[PDB]
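Marked as duplicate of an earlier ticket. Keeping the data here for the record.
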Amino acid sequence: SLLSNQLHFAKPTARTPLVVLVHGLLGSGADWQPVLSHLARTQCAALTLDLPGHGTNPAEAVEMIEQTVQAHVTSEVPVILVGYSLGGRLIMHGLAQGAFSRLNLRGAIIEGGHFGLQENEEKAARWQHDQQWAQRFSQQPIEHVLSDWYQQAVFSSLNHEQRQTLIAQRSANLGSSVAHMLLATSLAKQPYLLPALQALKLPIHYVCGEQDSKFQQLAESSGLSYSQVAQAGHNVHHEQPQAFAKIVQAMIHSIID
């Protein structure tokens, strides 16, 4: 069993790194098409994947990501893991646990992934918050829930037309499957990851949008190398796919000739 997946551009090899792209809650591998359009010019292979409960197919998610990437490479192929939001957190969690140790990992790019909450008080509040969203996704019309989801602060950069486009695209999701994934990977349950990450020899690069105050402050205070993208909020790969692809290219350039 693999996650739903698609290989792009080229055969992964020692000379052609594999860029693994992992979307966030409500998204799918199709979210990466704008970035891939720009990355096509760079010698690499890319792998898009659908997280459990997502796509046209509605420790565990992490294992399945590792297995799906492993199915496309040998130990000689350099791999870059790129994750947006939940996808970022899944990658960071795997990295903190040593879960990708049988891949030739050469870098990671994390776009708006939360390192975790530090205090039981916040974790409790987060669990309530996540349960309330999950119930909404379970039992209310998805377009109603999505209309509120896209009013969250992380999406402050978006205009009405952008929000409406996303509401429409995301309304294909199965509400119950979204809710389960939300809870199963709730931030409330996440160990704080930043110390484990800081200790890795692997280069880890954080990407934030300048208009996303919450994740810009996380990026800025993390001590990790980071890009802060002008004229973008949380979802940089949607808002500024060319700038995002340039960041991925820079890491590819850093690992091979």
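See parent ticket for discussion. The chain has one domain: 1-257.
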